[PDB]
Symmetry: C3
Subunit: 273 residues, 3 copies
Amino acid sequence: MDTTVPTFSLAELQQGLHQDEFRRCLRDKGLFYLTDCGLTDTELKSAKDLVIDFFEHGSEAEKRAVTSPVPTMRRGFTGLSMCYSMGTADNLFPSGDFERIWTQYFDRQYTASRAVAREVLRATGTEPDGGVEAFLDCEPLLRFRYFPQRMAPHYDLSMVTLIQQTPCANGFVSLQAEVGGAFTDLPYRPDAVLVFCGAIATLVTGGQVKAPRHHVAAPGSSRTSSVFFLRPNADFTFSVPLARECGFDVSLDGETATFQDWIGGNYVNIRRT
Amino acid sequence: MDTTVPTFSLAELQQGLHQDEFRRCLRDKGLFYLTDCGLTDTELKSAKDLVIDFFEHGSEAEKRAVTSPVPTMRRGFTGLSMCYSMGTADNLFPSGDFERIWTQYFDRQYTASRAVAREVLRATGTEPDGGVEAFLDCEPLLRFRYFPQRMAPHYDLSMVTLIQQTPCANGFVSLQAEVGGAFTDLPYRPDAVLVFCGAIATLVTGGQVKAPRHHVAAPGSSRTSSVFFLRPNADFTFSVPLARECGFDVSLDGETATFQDWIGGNYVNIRRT
Amino acid sequence: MDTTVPTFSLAELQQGLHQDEFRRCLRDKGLFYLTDCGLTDTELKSAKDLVIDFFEHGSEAEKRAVTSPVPTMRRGFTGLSMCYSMGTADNLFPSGDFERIWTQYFDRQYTASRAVAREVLRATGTEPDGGVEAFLDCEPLLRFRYFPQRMAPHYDLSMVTLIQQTPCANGFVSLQAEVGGAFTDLPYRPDAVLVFCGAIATLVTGGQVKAPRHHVAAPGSSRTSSVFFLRPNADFTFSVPLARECGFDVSLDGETATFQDWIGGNYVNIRRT
Ligand SMILES: O=CC(=O)CCC(=O)O
Ligand SMILES: O=CC(=O)CCC(=O)O
Ligand SMILES: O=CC(=O)CCC(=O)O
Ligand SMILES: [Fe+3]
Ligand SMILES: [Fe+3]
Ligand SMILES: [Fe+3]
């Protein structure tokens, strides 16, 4: 009945500690807080401050200069509530300190994400087709969103998703996840990042990892979130019969398929039941 | 102007009776009640009782044991309102009498579905590419849903869909379908199953069969439905120009395509206009 | 800061006038009114009158005769609010003067659309793979919609979309587009058609053209719109790295891809952020 969202130290997992507790969490819950992963509250504030300054004080001209011509929220600025997005390349940076700060922040996120994904693979004895490092050298997307003073349940289609929130001034907890058949609060932890396992973790490990559903509840209620999707390459290859065995309703002829075969030609980050 | 949802006896259709009335119904309405198809109210109650018992009385542990790690509603239990899903293989059965009861129920549904699909093909002089039996040896999905005391209009992308409902205690009729340009009640019939023709019937027969839109209206209002989708294999092959002729807005290069080419790498069961 | 939706004369653009103003509009706004393109208010009324007469006075039998068996809104009549759709072939025409009127109207729309698309390509120095004329000999869809006395923001996935509205009797302006970070009215112009650049303009020109988001606001509030999507052929081919550079979140292996590879096997006309 234990419906508590656990916390693991990345460093401790890397030492081979708590493997049973970790495997069990992955199987039964698919989400956890992660400490000791190089992701500090002080840095979150560094990056958050300068993007919030851009959101509030950037001109329409400065904003347009870092807005994509198609409004995909893949790179640069998106007005909706506002978002800033980046990946490993093709970024759009406002002038000044922004690029140095956000490149470093992105890098630390990407490293942490690969590192925890590596532990998810290790804990489940999983060797992706083509090898672990090729699998993790992938197609990440970071999105930073400001929400002024709400979201339908879905599960993520990432390998893993890392989430760093800033809290509502009034102390309301917006993010919730299904745990043990009940929606459970997922509050800000100045000391920890939240990790959701995505459908790709389920797929790659042959069903050893749960992709939990989550949502944001409606109620000083403004908040921001940094969401880092670790997304596989288009050519990530998996077994078709094995996908069917763990609940994927695939329409795929023959025995192996790629991520592109399954999802199509545009990334899809989330899915509803 | 006759906007009445008709009923046909499967046995009678199999005898070659009412071919005109049947062809006309398929063309102009795309839905009908089906009697004499091996699907009894007593069996519906047998299967419904033991899954309702599981929904109400199963522990979170028992539920988790038959819940997929991705919440696709393909197999086993899904909490949302609750659902139980199954196909021809890879099933997740609660302990005891459940598996025997639900395997038999699934089988009778699958047989009825193939049998009526065979009559839809016969009535329209349709020989699917690769032959009738290969076409019908396919990828069915049964979903049983409990609705506590609502759904946007869509059409189904199945060949056919068979629906067995249990009624609201208060006698409200929830399911409705467009018939003759008007939404028409589709009440429980203890003696009959409701059949919707899906877009695949339209596609395979070269437009001889309508895929009607339907929805569920809001008002003792609780209800359950058993929905059996007869879905084609990924390699079902059809003519591209012929698909375009009957209203399919296909983006497909060249002259033939497969169901996977059209729909993509995950089954999609329903579509909105 | 100039958030005004501009107007260009097609004839003048064809003369090579206003190239700077046109390039800038395409880059920063992605939409404009178009005059002198062979599309008269008198013709809009000719075609609108006879389809409105059909909507109001056509029998269910006449309507069924020009309704597709799948409710895709690709061709013929769709009851929802009502729609009439057509393309270059496979049309469904009510009896009488309708076909002559609507074929001529469609043709004038298609010509105007190709002509302005040709200018978008010229202004941006773009040579589509396979050449300009092959690219423009494509898969257009015209939809004419009556709205009785509302739509979420999206951008179009067309090359260009041409829109001819009829106004609300009461003078309410329903259609709005993001311009300079603000939603801007897009009123009826008896003398001009509205052109939205779509995501395919963005893609083909390597990011030189914006695909603006737009929506319809809620308030004599009835209105109609004629919407002509100029949509590429399934085999339209583009550079994968170049698509990524302009914000497309593609999951495509290797270096080139087709429109079908990206979008899948059914046209998708619109997308949300
Ligand atoms: O997929 C994205 C999310 O679940 C966003 C969650 C959040 O708002 O914190
Ligand atoms: O596609 C599924 C349905 O139309 C479900 C209908 C129902 O609720 O009975
Ligand atoms: O994509 C279609 C539209 O944006 C329709 C706009 C309109 O209602 O005028
Ligand atoms: Fe999520
Ligand atoms: Fe349905
Ligand atoms: Fe649009």
